[model samples]
Structures are given as C-alpha cells and as structure tokens.
Target: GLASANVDFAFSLYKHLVALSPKKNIFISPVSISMALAMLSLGTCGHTRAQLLQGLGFNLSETEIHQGFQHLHQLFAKSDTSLEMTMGNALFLDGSLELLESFSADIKHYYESEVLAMNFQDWATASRQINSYVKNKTQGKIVDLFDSPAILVLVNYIFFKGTWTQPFDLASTREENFYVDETTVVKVPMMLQSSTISYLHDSELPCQLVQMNYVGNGTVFFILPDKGKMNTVIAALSRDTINRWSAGLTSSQVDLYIPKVTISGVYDLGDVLEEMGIADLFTTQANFSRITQDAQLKSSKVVHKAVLQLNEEGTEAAGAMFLEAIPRKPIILRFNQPFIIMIFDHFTWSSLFLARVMNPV
Candidate 1:
C-alpha cells in the first residue's frame, strides 16, 4: 500500500491532463515527475512543505515519503537481463550560489542525485550542457527536455526499453482502421500476436485489461474499454482498482493486436502541477529556504519528456495457436479503438508510464 500514495498523485495529475486536453491522445512518465518533485520537497518549509507533500498525494510527513523514494531508487537500480532501464537526477546551479551542506547530503543520499556546477551566466553553454547530459543519460531516447535557465534548475528523468521475454513475432497488414473517434479514423500499421498472456475482464468498469510481460520484472498493461466507456473507466482508476485487476488476471491463450506506433510528449509540468494545487512552488510566496538562505528561489517551470516505442519482433502472420493452450476467456483482444496503456515496474512498486492511445502515432 506504500506505492498507493504515489499512484494517487499519478492518477490525479493525469486527470488534470485529461481536462487540459479533452480529445487528444496523452502519455506521460508520472513516476519521473513524482521523483523530481519529491527531491524538490526537501528544501521547502511551512506552507511550502505542506502544499508540496499534499500535492504529491501525501497527507502526512516528509520522513516517510523520502524513505519510500530511497527504496524505489534502489529497487529500480537492479539490472534486468532482458530490459534496459535507468533514471537520472541532477541539480544545475549558477556558480555564484551554494546549497547548504545538509541539503546537499540528503539529496545525494536519499535521492541519489548529484549537484552539477553550472555557469548560468553563459546561457548557451548551460542549455547545451544540460541537454547534452540528458542525451547522454538516456542515449537519445530523450533530448531537448530543458529550455529554461535559472540560478537553480532541478532535473529528473527516466529511460526504459523493454525487450519482451517471449517476444511477439509481429506482422503488419495493409492500412488498418484505428478509430480515433466516430468522425475520424486513422490508418495505422498494426501488429499481431498469438501466445499465452495474462488477462482479465472487468465487468464493473466494463473494460478488457491485458498484461504483457518483459524478460524481467517489467510489466505493461493495455486496457481497452468497451467503446465509449473510457470516461467511466477514467473516473474509476486508482491503486485499489489496479490491485484488484492484478489479482484477477488469469493466464490464457490470447490473440492480441496493437499498432506498431510510438507516442512522444513534452509538457510544462510546473504549470500542470500548479493547477493541481502545488501553486506556491511557482509563485513569489514560495519557500525553499533549506536550499539557501541568501537567495529567494521559486521554480520557473518543470518540463518533462517521454516517448514510447513498440518496434519489437516483426512477423509474417505465419502460424496458428495450440488448441490446448486456449482458455475459457474471450480469445481475441485488439487495440484498434481508443485504449489505455500503463507500464509498471513490479519490482520497484512504480508505474513508469501511463498513456491513452486514442490515436496511435
């Protein structure tokens, strides 16, 4: 249930994104934002600390949340034999300012993020070097995630690439119908799979949920609501529902079809988080005194970048499934309509990515 607190914030933050863009396909790495914000919370005091923790879905103290993140950081640091995943954090400060030693020690020990010396006087070098660090960290999976410079710039990001445990032998058909909405339908290159998969159908939410596995402990959930029930499904998502879904899944023979697509997103997260009740961090009333007593500090913006690429084993539609492997559940689940996807790190108790493929790109 510890991870449930993080899930609450993720769900709330995503709900805001839905309201901000009602009809657009949206994707995000919610955990990365949470980690970054959690690190920022260390330097806050009074109402600033209250709002920061509250907005992060913690109704309680700072000590516990930091404990959770430290455990999360170590859990994810484990190497996966079949997948590649890493998270990076850094604070870039103008050479003139100095963080308190206590603050520096906590950030390095609890968050595993190191402070980098930066010369904010040189805007070109600052931006280039920051982006360069991001590019090097993610191996180009992420870039241009920063464009603003301040006395202090807090950076946090995660990179994940999962190679399937039982990789699908996918095949592309002629232009396939991917219904964006009633009036608009997009043609996309779709892939096919027929294998033993973990699945469940929630009659209450009236949606089909399927779990796709990677070689190690990484898990991906593709949820397809029955037609127009996505709004209903959205209203019902939370930690308990996720746990129920996890417990209800059964191993069955599945014929899964999904778009061979990628969805990339960049967001002004500070604005969104501001709208979600972490307002002071971006306003003059902000209190980050633990960082430095001499300088007044408030975040200008928090930008986040995330990308999901499914370019796995391509197939020729060559074969059929074993009759004995088939189960009593519905045999086919195709993601041709608007659907939801969540990539969770089971071992780390973190949900890495949450997305809606309303229109596959």
Candidate 2:
C-alpha cells in the first residue's frame, strides 16, 4: 500500500525549493524559462519520462510554454550565431541578451565544477552556493533559493533567468490592496503598465486572459481568474486542458492591466508527484544509483526556489533548490530555520558566482 519513501522525499525537496522562492520576480515568470532549459538539458540526458511547465494564475498555452523551453534550449545549448539569432528574437520580444549571456556563462561554470568536487560537500552546501550566486548576479533582488538542509539530495540544482516583454514603470508602482482571501488583504506595491493589448473575460470559468507580447520575442498569455476562482482553476489543470488553451489563442488589441502583486507559496512535491502518479522515487528501495558514486543511498526529495524581479529596466531573476537525505537516523539533522552553506563540484557543476541574501536579517 506504499511507494518508495526515498523518491517521495525527493519530490518534497523540489516542492520546498519552489516554496522558498521570492514572491514577485522568479517564481511566476522566469520559471517558464528555467523549466524549459531544464527540459532541454534533462531531456538531452535521456533519462526524463516527462517534461512540463505549470502556472496557476496565467492562461499560458502548452505550445507557447513548450516553445519557450525549446527556444531557451537553443539559446543556450546551440552555437553563438544561433544564440545571437535567438537573442535577437528575445530582444525584440521584451527580454535581454546580456542577462541571457550572463546566465549561460554562470551555468557553464557550474557544470565545470561538477567534474571537480564530485562528492565532498554536504547537501546544504550545494543548495546555498547556487542560491548565493544567483542572488548576487541579480543584485540581491532575489532572496533565499534553498530554505534548509533537509532539502539537499532530492533536487538537482536549478537556474532561472528572464524578464518582461513590457517593462513596468517604477514611478507608477505604488502600494495597493491585494486580496489574499475574502477577509484578508495585504498592502503591496503592484507593477503597473498601460497599453493596447488583447484580453478576455470568461464568465463560464469566471477568469480573464490577457496577452502580453514580448516587445520582439513572443508573448505571455496572462490568465487571471475571478478572485475566488484561482483554486478551482488550478485544480482543473491537466495536460489536455492546457493544450486546448494553447491551441485556441487569438490576437487582438485592448488596454492591458495587471496588479504589482508578489506571492511566494511552496508545497511539498510529494503531493504533486503523487497527484501525477510517480511514487517510486521516495522509497528506500528506489533507484537513484545514477546520481552519485556511492551505492548505499536513497534520495529524499528535490526542492527548488524561484525568484523574479520586474521593473522598468525589464526583469532580473534567479532560482536555486537542491535534494537531500532519506535514511531515518539516530543522529537526526533537522533543517528548521536558516543557515549558511556552500555546494561546489569540480566535475559536472561549478559555481558561477556567489550571491548573499543581504536582506535586513
């Protein structure tokens, strides 16, 4: 009546990383870029059984998301001239090649380390180092990527970098009321923009879809559900429904509007993976023999933290999450609060840069 707990632990790790990410910048937008890149890289490794990108508030299509990931893969893994063409397309869409170059360079260095430090550092070290580098590159706009040591082994490190097609004006951003629930509202600074864009409100689903084109790149199909309908819509998501939405897009022009809202919500991957029906990764008898050199090991979970920043200058973002241990032990190490650590490999992964979470601690 149970699956492998080791794999379950790994999924939880990914969920935790997603939870610890920044509210505004990385999670919602850049994740598409990250997931896409990961799909390309992981897919190329030929071990992947599935690849997907999921968003809760937006009405982005599956084709669009798939294209975004494929385009990003070509942008990084392909030749310089190809990258230049991709960058040109992105620049025209509402993005920056400079940022993309920086991201690529950083990941390359990380991969180098993968050859060097094959297995010396602890799990938290890996999680901390990745988050540190991304935060520094983004000027501390991104916060904690790895939340605790409990999440070291389950996740492979993550990297995400992207920006908006239509940048938000800083002067126009002001504190506004954001409804969290029917009875709760938080004052937050919402990014604002005004322009001719295409949008639709579906009375049936009680949700709205707004298309934001990348000045020269592509478009972000922003889907905002009726206030109370978010949870309902999220519950209704599936591969088929997502593909249908992607296939049914039309182009039109109307005024565009979006709240400068920031949200950082993380869940345990165990539920998400279970919901998706992958339960073998968490058990003690699972097969992660490909991850490390040692044999007596079972992975617990994989965590990911995504951070995003949207301003008039465009967008700057980053995400870092890691995987951790599974064997129940007498000497237990609980990652309850926060700590400082580093993860670097001399072989397959390297540290591109170190980013300190210089928030007012």
Candidate 3:
C-alpha cells in the first residue's frame, strides 16, 4: 500500500534531517513532498526516473506509483466537512519551456497538479506570484516562499485543522520550563488534559507513545523517548516497528501535558534528495526531456515550507494537576522535553505530518 511506503519514506527523510541538524525544531509534511516528487517523475526518464522512485521508497513501476498517489488522494477526499485537510502541488514552469502533451496529462491525472507558466526573466514578479499562491494555498500561514524564482520550480503543500475529541480545561495551562537538554531550558505554555486515549510505555524503544484522536478518524502520536535515549528510538522507527508498538497501545486514562507548539522549517531539499540516492536529477546527466526539448531540464533546487501548530480548542485555560482529583490514578505523561510528533489518518489516509521537536518555540 502507498500508506506504508509513504510512511517508510517519511522516516528515511526524517533520519537525514536529524543527522543534518540534531538540535533544532523540525516540521515537514511527507505527503506534500511525496506527491510533488511523483509529479516530477512523470516528466523524467532513465536515471532521473529511477533515482526519484527509489528515493521515494518505491520499487514499483512508474504507472503504479502515479496510481498510488491518486488512491491516496481519494482516501483524503473521504474525510467529512468537520475536518479541514488538503494536499496539493503546483508547477512553476519557465514560460520559454513547452511541456510535452503526455507528461502534462498524467501529472494532472495522477497528482492533480496544475502547471502555471511564469517568466523567470521577470523574476521579481514571478517571486511575488509564487509566494502569493503558496500563501493562499496553505491558508495564508506561510507568506514568503521564494525571493528569487528558479527556472523550473516544483512546490508542494499540505494544510490541516482538527480539534481534539476531548475538550481540555482552561485552568491548567501556564508557562512552564521545557528542558531542551540537560543544560538548555525555555519557558513554554503547557496544556494539561486527562482523557481515555491510546498509550503505550514501550520497553523496546524505551519510549512512551501517546495516540490522541481528532473528531473524525485522524490521529496524532507523541513519542517521548527517555532522556538520552533518542538515538535508540530513532534507529527503530521503521514501519513494522511502529505497528508492533501500535498494537500494544492500551486505551485508558492518560495525563497529557502538551506544550502549545508551532514549528516551521524552510528546506532546500536538493542535497537531501541527493543523499537519498536522487543524485542524477541534480546533475547535468538528468533527462527531463518530456518536460521540454528546447532546453535540457535538471532540477536546481526544490524549496519546501511546512508549518505545524498544536493548541487546545474551546477554553483558553490550564493549571497545575493534582493527583488527589483522580479516582484511579494513571501515568502522568508530561511532554515537557523533546519528542516526535506524527499526525495522520492511518487507516483511511496516510501520514500528513511528522517532526522531532527538540524545542517547542
């Protein structure tokens, strides 16, 4: 299934991010990047096509990969009106380039992407146009996308807004100190709640995994590794490993102290893609002949921007928790330190968001 393949690719990319920068907040939308690359592959041939698919965690044929994306999109379309989530792609092609007819039809057919022509000579206007398009597409959260537009730029985006199924009391939230590490600490607002949610104290990875539900079928997972145990947790974050722990999660009362967090990262994925075995697309050997014959097309850079925000809906309140109020005391899981966050409709759709929040600023 594309869901699992997509999930695998998410971890692969995340491990690289952790290696690239170990001590800063990270946020990314895997589905957005995957779908965009799927569109890019439609116009490629030879090594470029092979590299792109392999980088995406695919050994399947080109047609199968494209169809998988279409199926993934259909699953997302199954959501009700209460949930606001969307994944989309846009192609900013230099006006001088004329796209082939076959490639254009398949990109639109599979990835549902729209190709917009732009003049890179007038990059000033093109930059504004691209930024404005991204702003509106992502519900105006990301403002400045590109200051200088590339000759052929590919962009992807995902937007989601969902409320917790269980409401939180407003009296329990206050500014608390968050330990980024043994020495670094910062003040952040922590929202407190006690709900019957899926949780597991994983002895294998030695991490606590908390799965919370939205109103519909979407779920959010918070994996809090033990102090100095992030490396062990990171090494075992494969698809099967996740499902093993997932099956062990017991739905019970959990004391969740989540920091109201908002994290965003602006990534130039050229190097990471190269590191992920997508090297040919960056070099002059690339064969994007389907996109244009007038000029040899090779991707210079792929700019991806994603933002994630988590907050308590309804009342704006939080306060100190008292164990005396509990009739049957359960474990207190205060995510006051670093942890991995994943948001998705696992059974319906796939992973939409994934991050390792070293700091929640």
Candidate 4:
C-alpha cells in the first residue's frame, strides 16, 4: 500500500536538498534511490542500513537525518509490495516480477565475476561488459554507464523516458534568461507551450503535474515548482500536505509556461551515509547477508549517477551503476555544479519518469 504521507516526506526531503543547494545545480531525485536503499536494508544489519543512507546522495542534519531513517522504516511498513513491484511492473509488461528477478540475478553475477575476481584485468572486463549490457538494454540512451573507478558493486539501475502531452513547438523556443538564483543568470533557450494543462496555482506556489503513460502499463508524472516559491514550498512541505495537494488537484485548464532547462546532478553518498550511521557497509566490516550465499560477499560500495532532460516533448532520464566487493577507491562523480535530476520510485502509486520544460531553441 502506498502511503501518501510517506511519499510526501520523501519528496519534501528531496525538494529541501534541491532548494538548499540550488547554486550547485543540486537536485535530489531521491524516489528511486530511497526505495532501493530501503528495500536493500530490510531485515539487514546496521551496516546495510548505513550503506542505504549513503545512497541518498546528500548530507543532512543529525535530526533531519534521523527523520529520514525513521521515514524509510515507515515506508517499508506498508511493503506488501516492494519498490521492485512498483517499477518492474511499470517498465516491463507481462512478467514484471520475473523481469525484476532476472535483473537482480544479472546484478549479482556481475558483482561476483567482476568485483570478487582476483585478477585486476577482470575488474575492467566486468565493468566494460556490464556497461555494454546496460547501454544496449536502454537502446543507447545511456553510455559508459557501469565503468567507474570508485564503485565496487551496483545494487540498482533505473531508466525512464516519456513524451509530453502537449509537445512544445520548437519554433517558439527562444534564448531567455534563466534566473537560477537571484544573482546568477544563464541564457538558455526556453520552450513555450500555450496549451491547456493540468495545473494548480496558489498564493504560495505554482505547480504543474504532467502524465506520461507507458505501453499497457502505468503512467509517469512530472511535478515542477514555480520559480519564486520553489524554496519556500520545499521548506514547508510535509507528507500530509502533499497528500492534500495531490488530492486537491482537479485538473483545471491553465496556461503552461516552460523554459528549456538543461541540468545534470551527481553526488557522493559517503558523508551522507556516515551521518546516517551505516558506515560499515562501505568498509570490510559490512554485511550483505541478504544478497548472496557466499559468506565472503560484502558490499564494498554503491555509487549512483543520474541525469534528466526535459523538453516540450517529454522527459528522458538515467541512473548510475552500483559496485559491490572492491573497497578502497572512491569514485569522484561529484555533483558540485548546477544540474537537475529526477525523482522516481517503481512502487509509488504514480510513476514519474521524466519532467521537463521542452521549448527548445
């Protein structure tokens, strides 16, 4: 069962991180990450819990950090179906569950053959092969995906692509000023769409929710915040409030304004997980008893990288590779610049694959 409140909590945390780090172009699309981490930690030792938190990709205060852990626990409480159920079903049609099992097996095999191998050359081969598989599976939408120096094991991977309900007119796109912050401004081609859209505007925030339906499965949603209220709204968000917001939407006809925005975000899960107290998972002391039969199997590290492109047509997105077994090198894909990422969970009631303003220049 999906708890609207829990979803809201996760979104709130995501938005807060985004607002706080706007200059770095930091967007915390925590939906998929959160779900994977939460699922991986179920019935595991404290070490598993720690690695999962590290996967979230941003730092938090001790108090806020604790809230995240508690919130994750609450999310799992309603786990008659897991994140795998939500996403696998959305991505795959007839045999969603079976597909997920196969996916898990693929991951385990890659980890064992690549990370656990004694030969260093095998490490490179495993990395290349896994990356090639992912790239091919996603139809070349993602390339060089699994080849990372710092990652030893990857626990999860997600890919999403969607087209817009009202595609933007490429002709209407023009170069405009994007006020990323009060002081910093970037000139980018801003896409425009005048069609009637499902939108909600309040004194505090202007919001739009777009839907992208898959082939005989479900739909993915994109939620974009109004520019000015983006931060304020992020701060005020609570799980309960988001539930009301989602329910309150009546899909009134409104004019939609979209700017062509290009964003890329990456983060290191190390410090963030340390704050959450799940440090051992990245170290030799880590325990991944639930993942494999080999007693020597340990989750050396998990790293994630995500990208999002939104235009009038729709949104396209991809996630990072995970490595387990090798411990020592820390991959340095730092999201220190301005980049936008997506928030999605397979199990969430509504699937949100990609959300973007697509008035291309």
Better of 1 and 4 by TM-score: 1
Better of 1 and 4 by lDDT: 1
Give residue 180's lDDT in candidate 4 (0 to 100). 51
| Residues 1-361 of candidate 3: C-alpha lDDT, one tens digit per residue | 6666788888888788778778867787777778877778787788788778878988745777788888876666534555666666667777677778897788788878788988887878987887788778767877687743467766666667677887565788889889998889999999998778788998777799887778777787889999988878987888787788789999978888889887777776666777788887767677787766767876666666677677887211100000000000767998889999877775755777778888889
The regions of model 2 sitting more than 4 angstroms off are 1-113, 116-143, 147-174, 215-218, 238-255, 265-267, 325-361
Pairs clashing in candidate 3? 170-317, 170-318, 171-318, 171-319, 172-318, 172-319, 173-318, 173-319
How would you order the candidates by lDDT, starting with the best?
1, 3, 4, 2
Candidate 3 deviant stretches above 4 angstroms: 77-81, 314-328
Provide the lowest-lDDT 10-residue window in model 4. Answer: 88-97
Model 2, range 58-174, lDDT digits (tens) per residue?
Answer: 232334433443333343331231111111101000011112343234333332112112122354555555555546633464456554333223222333233445566677666
> What is each predicted model's overall lDDT from 0 to 1?
0.74, 0.35, 0.74, 0.44
Error of 3 at 152 (Å): 1.9
- The residue pairs that clash in candidate 1, if any, are 170-315
Per-residue C-alpha lDDT of model 1 across residues 1-361, encoded as one tens digit per residue = 4587788888888878877876877778788878888888888888988888888888765778888888877766545455566776787777787889888998999889878888887889887887778777776867565554467777776777677665656453445899888899888887766778898988778899888877677788889999988878887888888889999989988887888766776666655777888887777777888887658777766666677777554211000000000000448888899898878877766777888777877
**Model 4, position 228: C-alpha lDDT score:** 53
Q: How far in Å is the alpha carbon of 308 misplaced in model 2?
A: 2.6
lDDT score, candidate 2: 0.35
